Amino acid sequence: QMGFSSDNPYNKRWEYKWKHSYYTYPRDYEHTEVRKPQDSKDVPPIYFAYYKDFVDRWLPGMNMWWQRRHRIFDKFNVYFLPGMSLFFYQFADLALGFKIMAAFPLFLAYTRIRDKTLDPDFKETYLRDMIYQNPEITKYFNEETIHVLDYEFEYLPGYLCPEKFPEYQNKTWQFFNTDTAQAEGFFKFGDVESGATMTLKFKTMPIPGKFRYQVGEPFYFYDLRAEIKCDGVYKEVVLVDEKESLKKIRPFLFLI
Amino acid sequence: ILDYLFLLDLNDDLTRKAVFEQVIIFIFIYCTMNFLAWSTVVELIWPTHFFNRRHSSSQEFIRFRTYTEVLLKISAYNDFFYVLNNYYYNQKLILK
Amino acid sequence: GYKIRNKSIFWTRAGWKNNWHPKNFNAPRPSYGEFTMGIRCRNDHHSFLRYVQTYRNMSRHCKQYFLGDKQLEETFILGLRSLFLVPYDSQCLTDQIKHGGERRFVDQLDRDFELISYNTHPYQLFTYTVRNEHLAWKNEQYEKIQKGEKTFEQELLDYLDEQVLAEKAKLRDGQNFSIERMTEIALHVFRKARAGKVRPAQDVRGPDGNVNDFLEQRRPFEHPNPTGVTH
Amino acid sequence: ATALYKSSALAGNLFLYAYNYNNFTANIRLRTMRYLFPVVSLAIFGNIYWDYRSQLVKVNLFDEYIQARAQELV
Amino acid sequence: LTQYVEGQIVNRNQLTLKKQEDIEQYVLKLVRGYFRTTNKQGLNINSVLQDHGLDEFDSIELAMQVEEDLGYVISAETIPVLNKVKHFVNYINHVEQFKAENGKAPIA
Numbered sequence: 104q105m106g107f108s109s110d111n112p113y114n115k116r117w118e119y120k121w122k123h124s125y126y127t128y129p130r131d132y133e134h135t136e137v138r139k140p141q142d143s144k145d146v147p148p149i150y151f152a153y154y155k156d157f158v159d160r161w162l163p164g165m166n167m168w169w170q171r172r173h174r175i176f177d178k179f180n181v182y183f184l185p186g187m188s189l190f191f192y193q194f195a196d197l198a199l200g201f202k203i204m205a206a207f208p209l210f211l212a213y214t215r216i217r218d219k220t221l222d223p224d225f226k227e228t229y230l231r232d233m234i235y236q237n238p239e240i241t242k243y244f245n246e247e248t249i250h251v252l253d254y255e256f257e258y259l260p261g262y263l264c265p266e267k268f269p270e271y272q273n274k275t276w277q278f279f280n281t282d283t284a285q286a287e288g289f290f291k292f293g294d295v296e297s298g299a300t301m302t303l304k305f306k307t308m309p310i311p312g313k314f315r316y317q318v319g320e321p322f323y324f325y326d327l328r329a330e331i332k333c334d335g336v337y338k339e340v341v342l343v344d345e346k347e348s349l350k351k352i353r354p355f356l357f358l359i
Numbered sequence: 360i361l362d363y364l365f366l367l368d369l370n371d372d373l374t375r376k377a378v379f380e381q382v383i384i385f386i387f388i389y390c391t392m393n394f395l396a397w398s399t400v401v402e403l404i405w406p407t408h409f410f411n412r413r414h415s416s417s418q419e420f421i422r423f424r425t426y427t428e429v430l431l432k433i434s435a436y437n438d439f440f441y442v443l444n445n446y447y448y449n450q451k452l453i454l455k
Numbered sequence: 456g457y458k459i460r461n462k463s464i465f466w467t468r469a470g471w472k473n474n475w476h477p478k479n480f481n482a483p484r485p486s487y488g489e490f491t492m493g494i495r496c497r498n499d500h501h502s503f504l505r506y507v508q509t510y511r512n513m514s515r516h517c518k519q520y521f522l523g524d525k526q527l528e529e530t531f532i533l534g535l536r537s538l539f540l541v542p543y544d545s546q547c548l549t550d551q552i553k554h555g556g557e558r559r560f561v562d563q564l565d566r567d568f569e570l571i572s573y574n575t576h577p578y579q580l581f582t583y584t585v586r587n588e589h590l591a592w593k594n595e596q597y598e599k600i601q602k603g604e605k606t607f608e609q610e611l612l613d614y615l616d617e618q619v620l621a622e623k624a625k626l627r628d629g630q631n632f633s634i635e636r637m638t639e640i641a642l643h644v645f646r647k648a649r650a651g652k653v654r655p656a657q658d659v660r661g662p663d664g665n666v667n668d669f670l671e672q673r674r675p676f677e678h679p680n681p682t683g684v685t686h
Numbered sequence: 687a688t689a690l691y692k693s694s695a696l697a698g699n700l701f702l703y704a705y706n707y708n709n710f711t712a713n714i715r716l717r718t719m720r721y722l723f724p725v726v727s728l729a730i731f732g733n734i735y736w737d738y739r740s741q742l743v744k745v746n747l748f749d750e751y752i753q754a755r756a757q758e759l760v
Numbered sequence: 761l762t763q764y765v766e767g768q769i770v771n772r773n774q775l776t777l778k779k780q781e782d783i784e785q786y787v788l789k790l791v792r793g794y795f796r797t798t799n800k801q802g803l804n805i806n807s808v809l810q811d812h813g814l815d816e817f818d819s820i821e822l823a824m825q826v827e828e829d830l831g832y833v834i835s836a837e838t839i840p841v842l843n844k845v846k847h848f849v850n851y852i853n854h855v856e857q858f859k860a861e862n863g864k865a866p867i868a
C-alpha cells in the first residue's frame with residue numbers, strides 16, 4: 104500500500120517519487136474533468152500556502168509513519184535508545200558531551216524510523232528487463248502497449264514461519280527488528296494490442312551480495328509468478344520459483 | 360497579558376539594550392539597496408526580449424508560432440484581414 | 456538592409472551557436488560503482504510522465520474559464536502545443552543539454568501550471584481580453600444583421616467584387632488577373648477606408664476627402680492639454 | 687504628535703495595501719505580504735498604543751502623588 | 761456534474777458501454793470529433809492515429825475526453841500507449857473487466 108497519499112487523484116504510485124518545481128502548491132487538486140469558474144474558489148483564503156504544505160506534505164508523511172508503525176516497535180528503539188538518552192540527560196548541565204550523547208540515540212532512532220516507514224521501492228527497471236526477456240510474456244506484452252491496472256507492494260508483518268525461514272529465530276536480530284524486511288505484492292498488467300491481462304505476483308527479501316557486511320539487493324524476487332489470461336487462453340509462467348531460489352540464497356537480517 | 364508583549368516597548372528601551380533603534384536603520388538601507396539592484400535585474404530583461412523576438416529570425420530556419428501569436432491570428436484579427444481572405448476565396452475558389 | 460558582419464558572432468568556447476552545453480570548468484565526469492560509496496543526485500527517470508500529466512493539467516485547468524467556447528478550446532490547444540513542442544523543434548540540441556534538458560523543461564512547465572491553477576498566468580488574462588474584444592465585434596455584426604442592416608465588412612466585399620469586374624472588363628489583351636493585382640486593389644481601398652475611420656465620409660468626396668480638416672485646428676475649450684503647457 | 691504620526695504612517699500602509707489589493711490578494715508572488723502584513727501591522731499598532739498607554743499611566747501616577755504629598759506638607 | 765457549453769450550463773451525461781460493438785462506435789465517434797483528425801471516414805478499428813494527423817499530445821486530449829464521457833480516471837502511465845483505435849477499445853474493456861472482478865477502479 105502507498106503510505107504517502109494526498110487528496111490528489113492521479114498517479115498514486117508516483118506521489119512520493121515526483122519532485123515538483125512548484126514554489127507552492129496548486130490552488131486546487133488535479134481536476135478529473137473540466138469544471139466551472141464557480142466550482143473553484145478564487146483568491147484562496149489567507150495562509151493557504153501553509154495549510155497545503157501541512158495537508159499535502161506533513162500529514163501524508165505522518166500517515167506513512169502511522170501506517171507502518173509496527174516496524175519500529177523494537178526493544179532497541181523503544182527501550183535502549185530512549186533509556187540511553189535519559190541516562191546522559193541527567194548530567195546535561197555538567198558539560199556539553201552529555202547533551203550530545205543524550206541526543207544522538209534520538210537522531211539514530213529517527214533515522215531508523217525514517218527508513219523503515221518509507222514505501223518499499225524495488226528496482227522496477229530490473230523487473231521489466233526480466234519479464235521482457237521471457238518469450239512467453241513478450242508474445243502478449245510489450246512496453247509500448249502495456250499499462251498498469253493495479254499495484255500493491257507492502258512489507259510482511261512479524262516473523263515468518265520458523266521452518267521456511269529459521270534465520271529470524273535469532274534473539275539478537277529480534278532485539279533490533281520486529282518485522283522481517285520482506286515484502287509481497289502483485290502487478291495487474293494489460294496489453295492494449297493483444298487484449299491480454301496478467302497478474303504478476305512476486306515476493307521479495309533482502310540478500311547479501313559479493314561482500315561481507317553490506318546488503319546486495321534489499322528487494323530480491325525469490326518468487327516471481329505470472330498468471331496470463333487472453334481471449335480464450337490461460338497461461339501460468341514461473342520466472343522465479345521459491346523452492347529453487349531458497350536453496351541457493353538466504354535472507355540478510357538487517358541490524359540497525 | 361503575558362510578559363512577551365513587553366517587547367513592544369520603546370520608551371524604556373535604553374534600560375535593556377538600546378539596539379533596536381540603530382539596527383533598523385541598516386535594515387531600511389539594505390532594503391533600499393536591494394530594491395535598486397533587484398529592480399534593475401528583473402526589469403532589464405525586456406531589451407533582450409524585444410530585440411530577439413524581432414531580429415533573431417532567419418530564412419535558413421523555421422520560425423515557429425508562439426502561444427500569443429496563435430491567439431492573435433485566430434481571435435484578434437481585424438476587419439481588413441477578414442475581408443481579404445474572403446475576398447481571395449470568393450474570387451479564386453468560387454468565381455475563379 | 457543590414458546584416459551582421461562579424462563572422463565569429465555565433466562562436467562560443469563550446470562550439471558554434473552552442474546554447475545547450477556551455478563550457479565550464481566543473482565539467483560532468485563519470486562514476487564507477489566499484490569505487491563509489493555514496494552519492495547525492497536529484498536526477499531521475501520521471502520526467503516523461505511528468506511531461507504528460509503537466510499537459511493534461513494545463514489543458515484541463517485552462518478550460519475551466521473558457522465557458523464552453525469550442526472555438527477557443529481548439530485555439531488554446533494549438534497554442535498549448537506550441538509551448539510543449541519547443542524542445543522537439545528548436546535549433547538547440549535539447550538532448551545534449553548540460554544536466555538533462557528533459558528535467559529542465561518539465562520543471563519549467565510546472566512553474567507555468569502553478570500560475571495556471573490560480574488563473575493568474577499572463578497567457579490566461581491575455582486570452583480573456585483578446586476573446587472579449589473579438590466577441591464584442593462579432594456581436595456588433597450580429598446586431599446589425601438582425602436589423603437587416605449591412606455590415607462594414609460586407610460593404611467592402613461588395614465594393615471589391617465590382618471593382619474586379621471593372622478592371623477585368625478592360626483587361627482583354629491579357630487574361631491573368633493575378634493575385635498581385637487583386638491585392639493592390641484591396642489595399643488601396645483599405646488605406647482610404649482606414650483613413651475614413653478617423654475622418655468619416657461626409658459627402659460625395661468620400662472618406663477623408665476634405666482639405667479643410669487639415670487646416671489649423673485648436674483643442675476644444677472643454678478638453679485642453681492636460682499634460683503640459685501650451686505657450 | 688509622535689503617536690499621531692506613527693498612526694498616520696500605519697494608515698498609509700493600509701492605503702498601500704488597499705490601492706494594490708488585487709495584486710496582494712491574487713498574485714501568489716506577493717503571498718508572504720498578504721499573510722504577514724497584518725502581523726506586522728499589529729506589532730506596529732502594539733508599539734504605538736503600548737507607548738501611549740504607558741505614558742498615560744505614568745502621567746496619572748505623577749499627578750496623584752504631587753497632590754497627595756502637597757497636602758501632607760501643608 | 762454540470763459544464764458550460766457555448767456559455768450555457770448543461771448537465772453532463774455519462775455512458776456505460778458494457779458491449780464490444782458499442783465501444784468501437786464510441787471511439788470512432790470520439791476520434792472523428794477531434795478537430796485535428798484527418799481522413800475521418802478512412803478511420804477504422806486498425807487505424808494508426810499517426811496516419812490521421814495525431815501525435816502524443818493529441819492522444820492526451822482524447823483520453824481526457826474519455827474521462828469526461830465515461831467517468832474514468834486514467835493515469836499518466838497509460839496515456840502514452842494509446843496510439844491506435846484498437847488500443848482505446850481494449851483499454852476500455854480492461855477497465856470494465858477490472859471493475860467487474862475487483863469491484864473498484866484501476867489505480868490512477
Ligand SMILES: CCCCCCCCCCCCCCCCCC(=O)OC[C@H](COP(=O)([O-])OCC(O)COP(=O)([O-])OC[C@@H](COC(=O)CCCCCCCCCCCCCCCCC)OC(=O)CCCCCCCCCCCCCCCCC)OC(=O)CCCCCCCCCCCCCCCCC
Nearest residue numbers: 690691692693694695696697698699700701702703704705
Ligand atoms: C507643494 C505643497 C506641499 C503640500 C503637501 C501635500 C502634497 C499633496 C499630497 C498628495 C498625497 C496625499 C493625497 C491626499 C488626497 C488628495 C486627493 C487626491 O487623491 O487627488 C485627486 C484624486 C485623483 O487623482 P488625479 O491626480 O486627479 O488623477 C489620478 C489618475 O486618474 C490615476 O488614478 P489613481 O487612483 O491611481 O491615483 C491615485 C492618487 C490618489 O489616490 C487616492 O485615492 C487619494 C487617497 C489617499 C489617501 C491617503 C491615505 C489616508 C488613509 C485614510 C485615512 C482616513 C482617516 C480618517 C478615517 C475616518 C473614518 C474612520 O495618488 C495617490 O494615491 C496619492 C497617495 C499619496 C501617497 C500616500 C502614501 C502613504 C504611505 C506613506 C505614509 C507617510 C506618512 C503620511 C501618511 C498620511 C496618511 C493620513 O482624487 C481621487 O482619487 C478621488 C477618490 C474618490 C474615492 C476615494 C474613496 C476613499 C479612498 C480612501 C482609501 C482608504 C484606504 C484604506 C483605509 C485606510 C484608513 C484606515
Ligand SMILES: CCCCCCCCCCCCCCCCCC(=O)OC[C@H](COP(=O)([O-])OCC[N+](C)(C)C)OC(=O)CCCCCCCCCCCCCCCCC
Nearest residue numbers: 107118119120121122123159160161162163164165166168
Ligand atoms: C513532547 C512534545 C513532542 C515534541 C514536539 C515535536 C514537534 C515536531 C513538529 C515541529 C517540527 C517540524 C520540523 C519539520 C522539518 C522538516 C519538514 C517536514 O515536516 O517534512 C515532512 C516530510 C514530508 O516529506 P518530505 O518533505 O521528506 O518529501 C516529500 C516529497 N515530495 C515532495 C515528493 C512529496 O515527512 C517527514 O519528514 C516524516 C514525518 C515527520 C513528522 C514530523 C513530526 C510530526 C509530529 C507529530 C506529533 C506532534 C504532536 C503535537 C500535536 C498536539 C496537538 C496540538
Ligand SMILES: Nc1ncnc2c1ncn2[C@@H]1O[C@H](COP(=O)(O)OP(=O)(O)OP(=O)(O)O)[C@@H](O)[C@H]1O
Nearest residue numbers: 120224225226227228229486494495496497498499
Ligand atoms: N546511477 C545513478 N547515478 C547517480 N545517482 C543515482 C543513480 N541512480 C539513482 N541515483 C539516485 O538514487 C535515487 C533512487 O534510485 P532508484 O533506482 O531506487 O530509483 P527508482 O525510481 O526506484 O528506480 P526503478 O524505477 O528502476 O525502481 C534516485 O532517485 C537518484 O537520485
Ligand SMILES: [Mg+2]
Nearest residue numbers: 224225226227
Ligand atoms: Mg523503485
